[PDB]
Every structure is written in structure tokens, then in C-alpha cells.
Predict the 3D structure of the following.
Amino acid sequence: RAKAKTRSSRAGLQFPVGRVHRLLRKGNYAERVGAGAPVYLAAVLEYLTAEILELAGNAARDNKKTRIIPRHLQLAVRNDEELNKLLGRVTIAQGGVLPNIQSVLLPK
Amino acid sequence: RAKAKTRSSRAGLQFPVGRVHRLLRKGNYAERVGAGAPVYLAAVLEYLTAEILELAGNAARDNKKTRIIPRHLQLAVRNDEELNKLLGRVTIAQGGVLPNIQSVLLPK
Amino acid sequence: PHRYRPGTVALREIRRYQKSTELLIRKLPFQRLVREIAQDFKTDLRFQSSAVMALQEASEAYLVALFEDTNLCAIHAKRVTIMPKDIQLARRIRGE
Amino acid sequence: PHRYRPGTVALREIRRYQKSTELLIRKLPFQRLVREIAQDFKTDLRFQSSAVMALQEASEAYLVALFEDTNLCAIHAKRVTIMPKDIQLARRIRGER
Amino acid sequence: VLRDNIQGITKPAIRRLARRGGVKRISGLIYEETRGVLKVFLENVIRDAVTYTEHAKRKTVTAMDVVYALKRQGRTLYGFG
Amino acid sequence: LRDNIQGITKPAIRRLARRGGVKRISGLIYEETRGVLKVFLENVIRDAVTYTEHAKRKTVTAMDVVYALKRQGRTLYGFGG
Amino acid sequence: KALQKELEQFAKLLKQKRITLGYTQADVGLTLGVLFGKVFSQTTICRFEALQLSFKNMCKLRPLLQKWVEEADNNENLQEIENRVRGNLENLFLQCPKPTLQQISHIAQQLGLEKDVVRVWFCNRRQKGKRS
Amino acid sequence: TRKESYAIYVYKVLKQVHPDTGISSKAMSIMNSFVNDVFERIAGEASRLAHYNKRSTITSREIQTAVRLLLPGELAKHAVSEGTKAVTKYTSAK
Amino acid sequence: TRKESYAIYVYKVLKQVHPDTGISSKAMSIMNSFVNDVFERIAGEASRLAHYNKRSTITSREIQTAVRLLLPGELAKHAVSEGTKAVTKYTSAK
DNA sequence: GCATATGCTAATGTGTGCATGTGTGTGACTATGTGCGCATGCATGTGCATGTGTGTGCATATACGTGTGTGCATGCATGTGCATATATGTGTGCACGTGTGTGTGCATGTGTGTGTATGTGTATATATTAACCTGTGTGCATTGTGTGCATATATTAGCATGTGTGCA
DNA sequence: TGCACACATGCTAATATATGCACACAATGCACACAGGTTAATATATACACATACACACACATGCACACACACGTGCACACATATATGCACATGCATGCACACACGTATATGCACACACATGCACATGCATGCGCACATAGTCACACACATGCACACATTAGCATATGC
């Protein structure tokens, strides 16, 4: 045989193409799975993970932290309009809420 | 061999047990489907159909109508506490709304 | 000449339209609106007659249910007149 | 003696509790509440420690989101104090009824 | 098709929808707000319906495409298949 | 385990309202909030226990709660699902 | 300027209408009271018809009398249908020209006079004593 | 071609509860949508239940648990009784 | 036994966008929860898309349509580009 | 005796100054934030190893391109008459301001129930192994189901009557 | 109480929609035969419940008063109800493109089975970012004090009514 190359490396991805293919096969989604379907899905999952991690890392850097905690993920998701829509019915544990006081409640 | 009789008659049901089995098998729900699963599902579907139809037939009779129309189905569902919960996010076409006027809007 | 008090004809219209099931928006103007909105997604789209009917059934059901929620917000503020802020509050709470 | 005017320290608590993420209900009374409610479904029920924590996290998130909606209803009625009818309206609009 | 068809949703039509919703009194600014809300709702449903149509390699939006789009948005509709 | 709903104390409910941005609280909120939380917990726990029966287990796991929450449209992150 | 002669002509005609209508000056004050609410005493009407009041007062009572003479012509039937206290207070002076309210209350209770009456009388006592 | 629907089976159910009551074509379409919607909800929940428990078979036990999760309280109790009775009769007869 | 998760892949992505930033175990669990959630949504929508069109296989075309249906405006456009670029690069190298 | 003219002085009024009240611009008080120093436990890197993804042919069936015929959606043209738009008058609901009671927030003192650590016994969730019953697969017989047509019912459209509510 | 307006009601024709029927056919059932998923019994490690202990921070109750909510009243213009002219939606047909669906051959691609490495997860330290707490700067509160603006009241001028004097 030739040297075994992972499909993720072939597609230039960090997420596991082979695992996604197996999960699609055993997830009872269809009786057949195309060759490019796990590659496309793994790339999309990797892109979305990078979007959140980049925003959460910026939030962690703002609070003078070197480690991302659930609070930074919550700040990243809720301050991003498109991520907030995607995760609008999702609760993040230990994430808290966004600081928001209605202007009518502020003293005059 | 012997004279073929449907599994619906074996289970004492009117809904098609054999068709539910095929819909379960080709619906991509699991690798295998047990023998009792389509029988159980068909009986539940038949019971829920009977519950709505008997309430809708009462609404049609209350309106001096012999034919069930979408209005009678909507009246049956929304006037039944559990059926309204089951179909809470369901829109029935040509069903209308329940007659409901807030008492504050009534003449003084 | 005979004249009804303000709100008397409105109450009759509430009873009239809460009893019937027909579509309350004119069909042809609604169809033109659907095609104009759809032209922003694809050019030279066609619609089945029942496809527009399904859109109108869902649109009117969505608006009627929104007005029911909007009416509760107006009554909550001790009013009987619905206002744009009533609609905005109802859509905010719904998650829209 | 020094006294803050009404609503001054209430606003301080809003800023304090919107900055933090810890659970606001005491853990032990909430665990007793969870087990009491589960008695009506089964007897001799055991709970994983993370199962109760998951329930508390969802419960507090649900209540905080409800209070945000309740606050908007009170402000809509030109008030600053939430009332039971504000909660009832928010749940009715949400469909939680 | 045409342009500026949102005005085709007339004030009497919006009033009838409010009557079915049990609304007794309507402010004059409601009609413009209602038109914006309807356009936003229709844009979301039609965009998904066309996406279903495009995937099927069709040029005609069918009732099923609208039904699937409505189901996708948590607004399942009965009576069209 | 009797009358544990009073374990959700007045200061605990006030802290939850503060995180929600509430500035002033009426005295009747606390009993209303306890009834709301009681209803919410019953719905989640009933589904979570139902998942436990199907697995033939006697221990409610974190996944059972997560699946129960997901079924109700209240997806929770950070507990294995 | 000529307002003087115009007032004088009005007053002469006013006397003529009053004499023609058979109304006494006290009756004129009563009519003014029941038609405006500011009943005037017959001394004011005397000083008017004789042109004794001051110019500002002259102008002030011109309009009321104008209105009465212009209105009453229609129908008439319905429209028709002490020294010892002084001496005691003088004795209270020559010793304390400006008493306090604390003493004023005692003075009022002593002589049975109203507090406002005693206060205004005290003020006018000071006024006429400061004239000279 | 042939389009498959539950119309004939809904009609037989109607003739038992209301022997002298008909149904309109629009109302029959709604009933067909209702049956398909409930079928997909139950089958989807049963499918997830099997995956959660590392099982590859949908059995009547998965269907029964899916019914309890999806139907409201008293509706679920009667539906479970109907399903159990049909499976018992089906097994007793075959 | 072995419990598979996405933690090691999430960590690799984190080092690409933030080489000096770590992640807590609780935050890693949330990221693992997020990946499984999005996977189930896309795969579920793609599964329905194949069923609506009477297809028995899920391909990259079904994934692309599911991504557009499930993701908001700019997220869908960029995710489609990443998915298309990976598929194009994949077939270029077999 | 009543009705006018006088002398004369209570009473107000112009005009005003103080006194009181309200609003705005800051000492003391409190609480959040910012480094600084230090231990903890939790994240991270390092190896076993094993299970899973991969490379390889292999056979199989789905999907796809091609052509086909047909429904059907689009556009047009015509007609009535229903609904829409405009304007007019006006009632009444919205909003504004006022005031008042009391409910709620703030702060204090006290104790008690929570949080943390510790340990233990027990129930139980988990994994292994054997076997067996149930589901799949295959092919054949065939009966039920959907399509396409008749058929006749219920539904819908008028016209006088019959309340039934509103409104002055 | 009586009048005017709107919705309803028994009533008759008309029709289009539902109901029933007959036929092919595709899907269901029947009968094997196979095999693997599931069950069951066992053992094992897990982690949950139970008890015990401590210290202390939070919860509870109280007292105080501030200001928010609720009722009240006012006025105004906004929106309802109405009438009238009219635009246009609805229905109705007619024609044609045209897209959709069926049907089919068939290659491309996916599953299958198997050997085999290697990537991933569990376990193992390890050190380092987070938490914890002390002191100190620092933004904020508000309360307090001061200054300004505004009414009665009174300093003196006007005003108007009383007692008695004259007069018709």
C-alpha cells in the first residue's frame, strides 16, 4: 500500500473528515453518503468553530485573560448578530447575560 | 400457503400497519424496525385521528352541518386543551380563529 | 341621520371576522407582492396557484396572531388602541 | 448615618449580577426541590451531581430571560416595578400557557 | 410582480386582520408598521422556499416548497400537502 | 422532602431579577415566580425521568436532562450535549 | 385731556337717565351689585354725579355705569324682583407707637374688635400721625 | 402516477365515530397533513431514543416512550393504552 | 471505554486563530456541544432534503442547501465558500 | 321721611423687602476597581495502545443525461360591481399633570442553614460472554389502493320575515 | 319607549363538490433461510446517598421613609363612522409556451469486505493562569449649603363707605 493520508489533510481541514463520514453513516440520515458530503460538512463545522473561537479569544483578551471560559463564549455569541440568531434558543452554561440596563431605569 | 390477511386486521386497526412499516423502513429512522413498532404507531395515529374527528363532527353538528370543513377542525383543536397543546405551532388553513373579545373592549 | 357611536361598528366587525374563515387580503395584490419579493432571489420564477395560497394562509395567520398579542400589550398599558410600540414589544417577547 | 436613596443600590446589584456568571439560587435547597418534584414521577430516584447542575443552569437561565421579558412589559406600562400581571403577559406572548 | 406592491396591502385589509385579532381601535401608524412586518415575514419564507426550489433544480415554486419552508421556521401549515 | 419550593428564597429571586435588569420588584412577584419555576421544573424533570425509564436506569443523568431540555426547545450547552 | 369733558357730559346724561328711570342712588348701587357683584354705596354715586371722585376712579367706574344704562332699558320688573374705644386706643398710644402682634391680639380681645380691623386701624393711625 | 395519502383510512375512522357525517376535500387534506406530522414527530423521537441508547432497532418500546414525550398528559395515557392493546391483539393473533 | 469528542480538533482550530490563548474544560465542553448541535441540524436538514427529492444519498449539494437554510446571511455565504473550497481541494488530491 | 351732599375715616391697593423654598453645585461616605503577592488545582504536554479510519479491489445500484408528452402557469382580453380612497364631522380615548397613600427599598442585628471537607457503605451502571430469537432478504402470489369516471347529495345564493341590539 | 339598523331564519333553485364505483397495478403478505442485534447472566468498578463536622456568610425579621403607582381630572386631536366617487379585483375565458414529470439506458460512484497502520483517547505528571486577599487609588453618591427667585405685607397713596348734616 501507499502511505495512508487522512482525508482531512487531503481537504486541508483540521476537523476529522473520516469521523464525520462515519457519524453520517450511522446517524440514520440516508442509506448512502456521498464522498464530498463529509468534506463539505467538516469544513463548515471548522469554519463555524473558528468564528466563535476568534470572537471568544478577543473577549478573553479584553478581560485580560489568557484562557477562554464560558463567559467569553457567551459574550462572543450574543454580541455577534449572526451568531446570536444561530444560537438564539441555546443556553450556554456559566455564560451569564449581556450587561444591559434600560435607559428609563437610569437616574436622571 | 394461506389466504393473506393484512396486519391491520390482525391488530384490529383501520390505519395501514403494512404501509407504516414501509414508511418507517424507508424513512431513515433506524437500521431495523421491530414487528410491534408499526402496529403501535398505527394504533396511536388511528386514536388521534378518531379524537379530532369526533370533536370536529360535534362542531359540525353544532353548526347544523353534515360535512366537516376546516372550520370544524380548527374549532375542535382550539377548544380542546390537550389538542391545542399538541398543535400549538400548527396553522390550519381556512380554519379561522376562536371567537374571543377582551372584556375591556366590551361596551360599558 | 342615524350614526353609531365610535367602537360599536368596530365590535360588530370583530364578531363578523372572528366568525368567518375567508382570506382578508385581496388575492391579486398579495400575489404581486409575493412575486416582487421573490424576484430578489431568482429571476423569472413561476408559482403554483396553491403555492401563493399557502403563502397567503400563513401570512394572514401570522398577522392575526400578532395582532392578538399586540392587543394584549395595548390592554396591558391600560389602552384600547394598538400602537407600533405594541407590535414592537410583542415581537421582542416572541423572539423576532 | 449614610443612606442610599431607593433604587441606587438596586442599580448597583444589576451591574454586579450582570457581570458575573455564578448560580444565584443556593445549590442545596434547589437540589431538595428537584428531588421532591421527581418523587411524583418515580420513587427511589437517584440523581447524578451534574444532572442537578444542568437543571439549575437551565432553570436560572429560563427565569432570568423571563425577568428580562417581564421588565419590558412593566416599562411598556410606564412602570419601573415588575408585577405578577407583567409575568403573566410575558408568558402569554411567549406561548408558555 | 411589479414594483412597490407592499401598498397593495391596503389599510382596510390590515383593519380586517386586526378585527380577526380582536382589535377594537387602531392607530394610524399601525398600517406602515404592519407592512414592514409582513414584508420581513414574507422575505424569510420566500427565501427558504426558493432555496428548496433551487435544490430541486426547478423554476416553479410549489406548495410543498412553501410548506417545507414554513415547517423549517416552526410554522407548520396544514391543508396543502 | 416536603415544601421545598420555599427554599427558593426572596433574596434568590431578587438576584435573578437583578441579572434580568429589574430595578423594582413587587411583593407578589416572589410567590408568582415560585409557581413559574415549579411548572418549568415539572416539564423538564418529567421528560428527563421518561428518558431514564427507557434506558431502564434508576439514576437521572446529565444527558437525560440535556435531551429533555432539547425536546422542549431549550438546548443547553456544556453538559455533554 | 378732553376725557374730562367727555366724562362730564356722560355724567350729566347719566343723571338725566337716573332721574327719568325713577331709581335712587342706593337703588343704583343695588342694581350694580345684582348685575355685576360689586355693589357700590350711594356716596360713590353722589360723588360721581357731582364729579367729586378722583380721575382714576372716574375712569374705573365709567364702564360699569355705561353697561348698566345700556342694559337696564329693556325690562325693569325682573331686575327689581365708637368714641370710648377711640379714647382707649388713643390712650394705648403715646406709649408704644408700633405694638407687636402679641400685644395686638390682647388689644383686640380687650376691646372686642376684630384682629384685622384693629390692625388696619393701627396702620391708619400711624399713617395720619406721620402725615404731620 | 399514484399519490399515497391517508384519506381512505381517515374516512373509515370517521364512519365509526360519525357514521352520517362527511368531510370536505380541504378538511381531508388537513387530516392527511396531521397524520403525517404526528407520524414524523413520533418516528423522529423514537429514532433519537434508539440512538441515545446505542440501539439499531425501533421497537414498540421506543414508540411508547416517544408517545409519552410528545403527547400531553391524558392524551398520552389513552394513546399508550390503544397502542398496547393493538400490539397485544396483534401478537395474540400472530 | 473511549468517549469520542471534538476537543482535540477544537484545540487545533484555537491554535490557528489564537496561538497564545487557552481554553477551559467547561468552555471546551460548550464548544463540543456546539459542534454536535450544528452537525445534527445540518445533517437533519440534508436528510430531509434528500427525502423531499426522492434521493437516497446525501451529497455535498444537500449539505450546501442545508447550510444556506440553517445559517444566517453572511454566515451562510462564508460557510458555503469554505465547504466548496475544501471539496474542490479534496477532489484535486483524490 | 326719604333722598341726596358732606367730613371723616376702614380698607384696599401699588409697590416692595424680606423671608422661605427650591434647585444646583460640592465635603464626607461608600463601594468598585487596580495592582501586588501567593498558593491551588486545573489545564497542558507526554506516552501506551487500541480501535478506527484508510488503502484496495470488487460488485451493485443509484443517479444522470436524453428524449418524451402533457399539464399548467403566464399572459391577454372583457365584463360587472364590490371594495377602496377621499373627505367630513365629532366623540372619546390618549396623554398630560396633580396629588396621596403605601408599598417597597435600604439598612441593621441575629442566628441558622448552606457550603466544604471527610469518610463509608451500598446500590448500580457498565462491560464481558454466550446464544437465540427476531429482523432482514428474497421471491412469488395477489389483494388492497389510487385513478378515472358517473352520481346526487350538501352547500350556496336570494327574498321576505323575525327578532335583536343600539341609540336618542 | 319607540325608531332604525344589522344579523338571523324558513324558504326555494341551482350547482359544484363530495360520494360511490370499476380497473389495473404496485405494494403488501407469505414463506422460507440467514445472521446479527439483543438479551441475560455474571462480574466489577463507580459514584451516589448517607452521615458527620465545622465555620460563616447569607437569610430573616425589623424599623424607617422615600417615591412610585394609582386614582383623578383636564383638554385635544386622533381615529371612528359615514357618504360618495371610482379604481380594480374577481371571474371567465382563450391561447401558447414551457417546464415538469415519466421513461430508459448506463456509467459513475458508493457500499462491502479486509488487512493494517496510526491517529485518538485514557492516564500520567507538571507548572502556570486563576483565584484569594491585602492595601490603595478612585469614581460615585448625596447630602448639605448657598444663592436666586418669588409671594404677604406693609410704606405710603388712593378709594369708598359710615354718621350725620342738609334738602325736596
User: Anything to note?
Assistant: The domain at 1-96 of chain C is CATH 1.10.20.10 (Histone, subunit A). The first strand of chain C starts at residue 46 and ends at 47.
